[PDB]
Amino acid sequence: RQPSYIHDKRYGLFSNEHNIGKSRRGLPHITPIYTKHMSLWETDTDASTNRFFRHYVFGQREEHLLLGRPHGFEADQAGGRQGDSAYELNTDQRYKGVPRPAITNLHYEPVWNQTLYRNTAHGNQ
Amino acid sequence: ERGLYFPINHRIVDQRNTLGSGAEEADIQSRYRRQLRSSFVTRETRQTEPPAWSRSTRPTHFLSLPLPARCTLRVRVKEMHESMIFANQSIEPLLIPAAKLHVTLGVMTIAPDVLAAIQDCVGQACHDTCKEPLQLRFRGLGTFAHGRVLFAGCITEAHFTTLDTLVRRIRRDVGLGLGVDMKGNPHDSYVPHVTVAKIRPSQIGQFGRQLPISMWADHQHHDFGDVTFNRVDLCSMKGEGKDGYYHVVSSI
Amino acid sequence: MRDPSLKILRAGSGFQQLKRMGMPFRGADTYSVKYCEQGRYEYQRYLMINRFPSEYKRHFLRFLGNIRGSKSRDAVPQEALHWLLRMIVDNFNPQHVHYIAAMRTLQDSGELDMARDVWKIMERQQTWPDTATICAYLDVCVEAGEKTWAVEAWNRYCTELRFLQAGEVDPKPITRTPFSLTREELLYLPKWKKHFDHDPNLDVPDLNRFNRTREVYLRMAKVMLASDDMSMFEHFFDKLQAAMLTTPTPVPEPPNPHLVRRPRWSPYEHQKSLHHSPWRMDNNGRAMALGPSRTIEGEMQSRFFSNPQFLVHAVKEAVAVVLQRHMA
Amino acid sequence: HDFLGLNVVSGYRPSLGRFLIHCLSKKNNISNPVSNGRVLLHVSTSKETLFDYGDSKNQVAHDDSIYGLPDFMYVRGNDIFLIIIAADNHWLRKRQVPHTKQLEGIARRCSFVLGIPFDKVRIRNLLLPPNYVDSSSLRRLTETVFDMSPASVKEAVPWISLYEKGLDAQDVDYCELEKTVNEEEWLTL
Amino acid sequence: RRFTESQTYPGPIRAATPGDTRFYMGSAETILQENERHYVVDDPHVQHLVPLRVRFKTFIWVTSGWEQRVQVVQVMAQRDSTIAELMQQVRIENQSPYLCTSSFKLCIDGKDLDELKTLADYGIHEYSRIDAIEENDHLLHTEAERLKDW
Amino acid sequence: RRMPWPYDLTSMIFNQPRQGSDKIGYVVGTSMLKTAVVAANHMVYYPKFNQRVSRTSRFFAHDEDLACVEGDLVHIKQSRKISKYKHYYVFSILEPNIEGRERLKLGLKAVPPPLF
Amino acid sequence: GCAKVLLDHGLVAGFRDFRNDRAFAVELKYFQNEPTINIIEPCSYDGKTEFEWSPKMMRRLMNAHGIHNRLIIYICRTADNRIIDHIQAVKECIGGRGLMMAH
Amino acid sequence: MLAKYGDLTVVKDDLTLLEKTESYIAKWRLNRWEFRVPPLLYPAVREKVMLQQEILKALCLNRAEEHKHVLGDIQIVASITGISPESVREKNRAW
Amino acid sequence: GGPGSPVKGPGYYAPPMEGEHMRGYTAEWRDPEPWERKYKQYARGQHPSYDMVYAGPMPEIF
Amino acid sequence: LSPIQKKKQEQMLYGVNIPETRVMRFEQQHPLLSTALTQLDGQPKGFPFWYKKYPTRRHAYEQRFSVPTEMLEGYNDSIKKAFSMSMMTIQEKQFAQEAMYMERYAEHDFDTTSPAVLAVKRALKVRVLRNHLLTNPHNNIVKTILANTERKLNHTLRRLRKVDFKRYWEIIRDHDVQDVLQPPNLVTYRQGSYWRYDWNAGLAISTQLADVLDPRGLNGCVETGRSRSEVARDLGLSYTRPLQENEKKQLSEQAVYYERLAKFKME
RNA sequence: GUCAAUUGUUAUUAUUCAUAUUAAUUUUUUUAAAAGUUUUUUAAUUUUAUAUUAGUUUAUUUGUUUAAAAAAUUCAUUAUUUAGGAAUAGUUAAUAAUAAUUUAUAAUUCUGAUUAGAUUUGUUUGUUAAUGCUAUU
Numbered sequence A: 001r002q003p004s005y006i007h008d009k010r011y012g013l014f015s016n017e018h019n020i021g022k023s024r025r026g027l028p029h030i031t032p033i034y035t036k037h038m039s040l041w042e043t044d045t046d047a048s049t050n051r052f053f054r055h056y057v058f059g060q061r062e063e064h065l066l067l068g069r070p071h072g073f074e075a076d077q078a079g080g081r082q083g084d085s086a087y088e089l090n091t092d093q094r095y096k097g098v099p100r101p102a103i104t105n106l107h108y109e110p111v112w113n114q115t116l117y118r119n120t121a122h123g124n125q
Numbered sequence B: 001e002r003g004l005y006f007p008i009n010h011r012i013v014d015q016r017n018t019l020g021s022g023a024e025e026a027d028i029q030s031r032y033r034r035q036l037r038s039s040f041v042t043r044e045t046r047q048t049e050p051p052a053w054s055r056s057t058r059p060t061h062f063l064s065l066p067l068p069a070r071c072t073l074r075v076r077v078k079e080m081h082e083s084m085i086f087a088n089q090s091i092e093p094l095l096i097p098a099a100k101l102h103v104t105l106g107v108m109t110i111a112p113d114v115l116a117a118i119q120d121c122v123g124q125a126c127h128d129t130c131k132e133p134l135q136l137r138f139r140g141l142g143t144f145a146h147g148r149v150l151f152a153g154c155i156t157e158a159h160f161t162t163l164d165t166l167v168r169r170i171r172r173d174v175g176l177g178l179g180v181d182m183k184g185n186p187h188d189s190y191v192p193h194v195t196v197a198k199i200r201p202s203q204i205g206q207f208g209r210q211l212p213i214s215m216w217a218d219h220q221h222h223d224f225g226d227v228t229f230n231r232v233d234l235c236s237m238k239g240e241g242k243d244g245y246y247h248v249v250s251s252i
Numbered sequence C: 001m002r003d004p005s006l007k008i009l010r011a012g013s014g015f016q017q018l019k020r021m022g023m024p025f026r027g028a029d030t031y032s033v034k035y036c037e038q039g040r041y042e043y044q045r046y047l048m049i050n051r052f053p054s055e056y057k058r059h060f061l062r063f064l065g066n067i068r069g070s071k072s073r074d075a076v077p078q079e080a081l082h083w084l085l086r087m088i089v090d091n092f093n094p095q096h097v098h099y100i101a102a103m104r105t106l107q108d109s110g111e112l113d114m115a116r117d118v119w120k121i122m123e124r125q126q127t128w129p130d131t132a133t134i135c136a137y138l139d140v141c142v143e144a145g146e147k148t149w150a151v152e153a154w155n156r157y158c159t160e161l162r163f164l165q166a167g168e169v170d171p172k173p174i175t176r177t178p179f180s181l182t183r184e185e186l187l188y189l190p191k192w193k194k195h196f197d198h199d200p201n202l203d204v205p206d207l208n209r210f211n212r213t214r215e216v217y218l219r220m221a222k223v224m225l226a227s228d229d230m231s232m233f234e235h236f237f238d239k240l241q242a243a244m245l246t247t248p249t250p251v252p253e254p255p256n257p258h259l260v261r262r263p264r265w266s267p268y269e270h271q272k273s274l275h276h277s278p279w280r281m282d283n284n285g286r287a288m289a290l291g292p293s294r295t296i297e298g299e300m301q302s303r304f305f306s307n308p309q310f311l312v313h314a315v316k317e318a319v320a321v322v323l324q325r326h327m328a
Numbered sequence D: 001h002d003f004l005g006l007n008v009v010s011g012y013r014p015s016l017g018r019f020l021i022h023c024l025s026k027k028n029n030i031s032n033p034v035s036n037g038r039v040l041l042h043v044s045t046s047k048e049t050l051f052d053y054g055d056s057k058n059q060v061a062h063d064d065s066i067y068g069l070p071d072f073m074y075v076r077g078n079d080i081f082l083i084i085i086a087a088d089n090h091w092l093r094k095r096q097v098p099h100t101k102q103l104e105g106i107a108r109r110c111s112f113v114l115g116i117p118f119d120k121v122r123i124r125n126l127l128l129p130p131n132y133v134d135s136s137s138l139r140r141l142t143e144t145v146f147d148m149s150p151a152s153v154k155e156a157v158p159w160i161s162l163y164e165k166g167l168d169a170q171d172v173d174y175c176e177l178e179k180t181v182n183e184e185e186w187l188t189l
Numbered sequence E: 001r002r003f004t005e006s007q008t009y010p011g012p013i014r015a016a017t018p019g020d021t022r023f024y025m026g027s028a029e030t031i032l033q034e035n036e037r038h039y040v041v042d043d044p045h046v047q048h049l050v051p052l053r054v055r056f057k058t059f060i061w062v063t064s065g066w067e068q069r070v071q072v073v074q075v076m077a078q079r080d081s082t083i084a085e086l087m088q089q090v091r092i093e094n095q096s097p098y099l100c101t102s103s104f105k106l107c108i109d110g111k112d113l114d115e116l117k118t119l120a121d122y123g124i125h126e127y128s129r130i131d132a133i134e135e136n137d138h139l140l141h142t143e144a145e146r147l148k149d150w
Numbered sequence F: 001r002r003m004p005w006p007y008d009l010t011s012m013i014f015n016q017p018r019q020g021s022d023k024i025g026y027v028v029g030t031s032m033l034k035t036a037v038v039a040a041n042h043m044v045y046y047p048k049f050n051q052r053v054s055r056t057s058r059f060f061a062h063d064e065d066l067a068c069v070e071g072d073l074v075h076i077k078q079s080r081k082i083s084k085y086k087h088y089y090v091f092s093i094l095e096p097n098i099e100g101r102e103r104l105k106l107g108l109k110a111v112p113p114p115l116f
Numbered sequence G: 001g002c003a004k005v006l007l008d009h010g011l012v013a014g015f016r017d018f019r020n021d022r023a024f025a026v027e028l029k030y031f032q033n034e035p036t037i038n039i040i041e042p043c044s045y046d047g048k049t050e051f052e053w054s055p056k057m058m059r060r061l062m063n064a065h066g067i068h069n070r071l072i073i074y075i076c077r078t079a080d081n082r083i084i085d086h087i088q089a090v091k092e093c094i095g096g097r098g099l100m101m102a103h
Numbered sequence H: 001m002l003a004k005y006g007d008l009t010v011v012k013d014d015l016t017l018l019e020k021t022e023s024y025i026a027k028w029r030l031n032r033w034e035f036r037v038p039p040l041l042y043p044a045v046r047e048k049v050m051l052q053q054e055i056l057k058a059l060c061l062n063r064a065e066e067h068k069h070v071l072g073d074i075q076i077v078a079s080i081t082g083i084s085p086e087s088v089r090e091k092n093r094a095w
Numbered sequence I: 001g002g003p004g005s006p007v008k009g010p011g012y013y014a015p016p017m018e019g020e021h022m023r024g025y026t027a028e029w030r031d032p033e034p035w036e037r038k039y040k041q042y043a044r045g046q047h048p049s050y051d052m053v054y055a056g057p058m059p060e061i062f
Numbered sequence J: 001l002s003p004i005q006k007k008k009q010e011q012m013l014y015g016v017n018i019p020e021t022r023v024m025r026f027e028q029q030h031p032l033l034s035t036a037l038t039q040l041d042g043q044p045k046g047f048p049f050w051y052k053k054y055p056t057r058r059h060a061y062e063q064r065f066s067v068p069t070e071m072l073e074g075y076n077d078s079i080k081k082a083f084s085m086s087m088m089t090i091q092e093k094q095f096a097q098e099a100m101y102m103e104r105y106a107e108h109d110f111d112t113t114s115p116a117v118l119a120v121k122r123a124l125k126v127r128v129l130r131n132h133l134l135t136n137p138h139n140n141i142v143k144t145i146l147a148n149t150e151r152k153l154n155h156t157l158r159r160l161r162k163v164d165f166k167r168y169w170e171i172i173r174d175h176d177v178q179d180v181l182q183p184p185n186l187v188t189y190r191q192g193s194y195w196r197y198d199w200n201a202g203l204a205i206s207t208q209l210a211d212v213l214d215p216r217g218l219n220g221c222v223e224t225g226r227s228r229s230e231v232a233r234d235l236g237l238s239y240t241r242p243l244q245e246n247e248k249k250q251l252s253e254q255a256v257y258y259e260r261l262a263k264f265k266m267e
Numbered sequence K: 001g002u003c004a005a006u007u008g009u010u011a012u013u014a015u016u017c018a019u020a021u022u023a024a025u026u027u028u029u030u031u032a033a034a035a036g037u038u039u040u041u042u043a044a045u046u047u048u049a050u051a052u053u054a055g056u057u058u059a060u061u062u063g064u065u066u067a068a069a070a071a072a073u074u075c076a077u078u079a080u081u082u083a084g085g086a087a088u089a090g091u092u093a094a095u096a097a098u099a100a101u102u103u104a105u106a107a108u109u110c111u112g113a114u115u116a117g118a119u120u121u122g123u124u125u126g127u128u129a130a131u132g133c134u135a136u137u
Helices: A005-011 A015-020 A056-067 A086-090 A102-108 B072-087 B112-129 B160-177 B203-207 C004-009 C015-021 C033-037 C055-070 C079-089 C096-108 C113-124 C131-144 C147-157 C183-188 C213-226 C230-246 C307-327 D013-025 D100-114 D135-145 D150-156 D169-174 E002-007 E010-016 E083-091 F009-013 F098-105 G002-009 G055-062 G086-091 H016-026 H043-081 I037-044 J003-013 J020-029 J031-037 J077-082 J090-104 J115-135 J140-163 J165-173 J196-201 J228-233 J245-264
Strands: B061-066 B102-109 B134-144 B149-154 B194-198 B223-229 B233-236 D072-075 D079-085 D122-128 E049-055 E058-060 E067-069 E072-078 E104-108 E131-134 F003-005 F022-029 F036-045 F052-062 F073-078 F088-095 G012-016 G025-028 G040-042 G073-078 G083-085 G096-102
Touching: A005 A015, A056 C183, A056 F009, A056 F052, A056 J196, A086 C183, B061 B112, B072 B194, B072 B223, B102 B160, B102 B194, B112 B160, B112 B233, B134 B160, B134 B194, C004 G055, C004 G096, C055 C079, C055 C096, C079 C096, C079 C113, C096 C113, C096 C131, C113 C131, C113 C147, C131 C147, C131 C213, C147 C213, C183 F088, C213 C230, C213 C307, C230 C307, D013 D072, D013 D079, D013 D150, D079 D100, D079 D135, D100 D122, D122 D135, E049 E131, E072 E083, E083 E104, F009 F022, F009 F036, F022 F052, F022 F088, F036 F073, F052 F073, F088 J228, F098 J165, G002 G012, G002 G073, G002 G083, G002 G096, G055 G073, G055 G086, G073 G086, G083 G086, H016 H043, J003 J090, J003 J115, J020 J031, J090 J115, J115 J140, J115 J165, J140 J165, J140 J196
Parallel strands: D079 D122, F052 F088
Antiparallel strands: B061 B102, B061 B233, B134 B149, B134 B223, B149 B194, D072 D079, E049 E072, E058 E067, E104 E131, F003 F036, F022 F036, F022 F073, F036 F052, F073 F088, G012 G025, G040 G096, G073 G083, G073 G096
């Protein structure tokens, strides 16, 4: 079975007990637990990582059927896709949308991310 | 059973009222939904609010597309005017002179060198763009300044897209390029409109704050007809109807 | 007869597996040795969660409620730091209100090093703190008495801060349009570019609009004054002086209603009288009967001052430390 | 700033026009800039028209692959030079190279309008790298196309020797374009 | 009052005195459709219609015996209005017949309000405490107060 | 057995704060006031067949300025309960039926009437 | 890509990409006047279903009762759109959808 | 453009101010390049302006790192030869 | 720690296509002891291997 | 047929000539030819100067067999009559009307797959097919292609209207082939399948909104969550369908109510 | 990165289908079980809130202090059975703390609604090598 720590990370640490404290809860149909492997999440993961998105016939098909992407029942691109659409082909999407988040800099300049406390200064010396 | 046991009127909470005081000291009452009325039901639209320091100063010049006569706009709104002086003769001192009906685009507080540079600028801002004769289809009346102004609401259907760039094109230049004050200083899109009515500041004591809803509740969404605009005009508002129109000092 | 390998290889997404995915023999020998290799928390991937537009604020308030509420009586001074972590652990990027709420609560509780920890966290989170936040950390640096801290934070974040010159316009109007997606950007840009959690560095462009630059040079001169490094203090306070007199009054910033207790409508007729009990005269919410437990100078925040008054106040704020420097 | 290709948008073509004027201003007159629109000529009848016709880098893709399009046309007299900023497209690039029919097509048409003798029309080409400019280009430009007294080159262009942009390997083939086989107009463009 | 006593200076100093500023439509946003704000950080200030609290007194027939509770009406007040309009303005928002049984003169702390004055002369804001007294304040002490069932 | 398939169009384009938070669909009905009926696709995946089919449903959404004309592509989201059946609001319209506005500008209905 | 894989396993003599859009040519190879490709079958009899293969779902096939058995060849289209045989597919331990089998 | 930067100091070898100005840019961490975009600009340029900022952002790191080791590259000589890090910049092959 | 492991991330940083700098692309790589001869051969793959695959039958001698 | 549809058949009986749009294009583009063509008038002209006039061989429809009217001048009038639009078989009279109309809407003169052209090519065929079918009522062979032609009609129209409704109105108004466009039924319209057809075609997002309804209001803020309208309200833009009277009268009342409250509760 | 593995003696052939095992009713004394809840000064008042019914498939949803103990809500999306199939009806929406006779014509329904029949809505079983079939409050 899936573990339960999946619940916390998606919603919140210890979000469980607060929800349990409901007066009319669990009777008769409880709100079940969101235990879904982190790579299988509906929202966060893209197509290249979530295998289910790689479905085509009723999945990626409608997308390219909407976006205008030249799409076939099977082809060279990821999911039933042959070539870019007129929009993708003509417009620059490097810096469109959310600005490049500052925390990216943490990668190339890694001195910032440093354990402030000695792991042994927790009480286990 | 017939009405909801706790209808929406019992499904309202307010933050100014301290939840825990108005709920836990005594019963609060207020016609809340009247306060939450959307700006669509009222047609109160947010034109650019000028900086308070500019609010003491009064508008001197205006750049505006003067309405072409014979167009469907007037013969529909002049049909409204006669319909309104019919409803209330009191609207006649309030009404905008049907001679002076025109699209109001920009308010500037200017003297001649200021006129000449913009004359070059709008003479270029149009020529930088080289737009074709604009056609703006008006529809739906609305209110500025908490009702003190009633204007021809300009829908964004026909040609507004190439237009509202013109606003931002001069506004970038006339405001920040050279030193010309405007009410809408920061590059801002000034809602272009034809003021069908306007309460004078002196008249506010005469007729009240709010131009009556019952006066324009009939044609709140009347369709005022597309008009083809070809010439932009910069004008001073010092006079009234110099040629049936205010004093002209530029055009294009 | 259909292949048995097919009869297995066909139903790979068999609802039995679906349960084990959670979509709706056993000794240590079998489990791989490569298990013990994964370093601490490397197994976790990135997580980009979008929360409800409202619940972005509610969740922030509860965090804002604990931090500025931790130092009540029971919760440890440290607790203010522990709530900042529980937010960040769950990917709610910690906004500037939750930073100031920590440094304020921590300083009030005599915790100075921990007050810096909150500052390093926002140095770790790579969140550029606005001027209002920059002065905050310098304030603990005053209690910390370290020139080595403020000088460090000085170069990194508040380098280009310049006094409002007489010719410059005034506190800048809001320029950051809220994040809005044209349908083109929405349909074609990938998921990772279409997720928006309020990054604290987004409004920092406009979080500097009210031009609190003057409070900076004072807090820095204060630190230079605290660490006996008066050689730096003069150059700062002199540069503060000459500009405090010529530059216009920096427009004071209205109080942020998220941080401060904004008052709220209330029927004050159902209030216990001052002599509600026969035994003692009480101080009711409406009227004060015992009087002020503290002598109050009655003056508003230093930012509400004029341009000169701040300067002479800067002397009062400076010499108060010269007291504490000696008194410490 | 443009010649070094740092202008990632609208790369160096208009600035190239300025340079050619400056390369030609110091050549004869500082009061030269007679820009009657697209034509920027010299009047001494030793004609040095610097007529720029259109933007090859940004028009040959969208319409009418008129290879003859000289992003700049600088006649020197008998020699009729063409300066074309080569398209980044390896494909359209061979639809910027003027072809034999276009060469003698222009030459027989410039002899009339400019009075240049029919025999002495010597039309030539020069295509710069697509996005940046190289150091050899500036030299062979100021040495052959815009024939310049070498001392005056230091005067008109002081930073010529200081220029260091060397052709990146990827875009060395910017020049080596081949004529399509006469029988393959279907497959090749 | 610390928040309010603070923002008292942004009144003049933020908007009135600065001969230079701009106010930018767009990125100057409004309230949501999830019944709440949306977590942005600024506003100089403005309130054209100041919501005025007007508290009343009316009896309700409790099961044991009559008792009077505090029915407060929260009315929107034009900051440039005269009180005579206010008394006229408020009467329509009763929502309960038992409130505006007859004429009533609005009152502050027992000191009656002068109708020919505006809210500026009296300096009434939201936190101003405006009771509401009916004409029969002399009554309801006399034995004809109200008739209960025994 | 027919289990709900979250991975779909609306899931792949939009990060859904929770299940079915936002939806996208065509404006089938604008007869009612401030309420644009939309038909959107919620997926069901059959583990038996191993093939998944689409079951299209009808949702109501609230458009304030009556901006949604018949035949538009709207990107709605969930919200507080407005009525017994409205809990959606038209967050944005992607594809406006230009004809629908113009065919109304002529004075007709935004779509020719159905046959049966 | 499939014929590219079958070729390297030898079930076919040799493919050729004529770059024709419609169809390319693959040379069958016979032994004992018996075709090398005894049973070749497409994994998904229907296009609507596209079965994906865990790196363990393939690995179980290589073991026929305790002997590492590479007799059958399964083709997998990796997420990176690399047409890969099940043998290499478990080598770098990556999954993909299942196109067909051959043995 | 030009009119703004107008104060003139002709006492500058091509290297000194640059090598000096480089040092300040050398110590620059990445976040220094965060808010350099002019705010109120069109999506037509709010795209194109960000790109050009990334090019300069690229080149500075180039002139920073590729010169960073150069000082060490000079120092390798000083640590071996024992001469000033300055004079190495002029020592020849014959040396 | 297989392929589903969170991406380790790139090493360098080259923002544009218009990334033009010679003397670059050399800054990515900047590469006593008695090693045993055989192993330094085997470590470089030049050493003749002997897999289990070159094993015949284990014959019954006794 | 119906009043609008038969209006075209009148233009079929006596035929249709070239529109002046083609003959004027040829002039303003090739001056030496038009000067040469009007110079050789009436004379038997031995060189086809008017070759650029009629690019596609089917672009010649004024006379029979696509014989261009210019070739006929040098002969006796007896010949010019035998090839007149009067003496055409009906099977040509369609190709005369078709090649005429399809020329008018041809964005690309040589193209025969432009959704405007492909529309009219079938659209006119449907009429004369209906013209036939109703006259002699029972002909199964004709009825089947009527299903095939309407399918290629709707597949063209529902695709066309997204390209440009302006041209599109001419295809529907002038021929009144709207009847096949009217949604098939309520179910296929209720579940959206009538609208989803534009999706299943791929022309969902193909408008280039810069023409109408400037997108500065069609996109609610993702940061804020504001609905579509609020971002127009905050920008002062209006995006409203021209209301029906059904929604007009109900909107008048909503605007007067809390004012009407000032009417009733003064009593 | 350690466990998928199929056992009927048939009876020309076609067609899952009599006599098999597993799990169940048959099948039997080893887990229940009776009354009087209990306070309190006031004939009173504090404290003493969901097994067992009747008929439901667009269905059932939630707490201000009660307790704890020293500004969190009334809404929702989904999934819904009958072999042979047509209408439903105190209506829908907008006003509003209207509307026993306001304003619209609206609302459900063949994408199978309403009435009628059966069934208490299922992290629970059994069978199996297993998508499945087959139970459950």
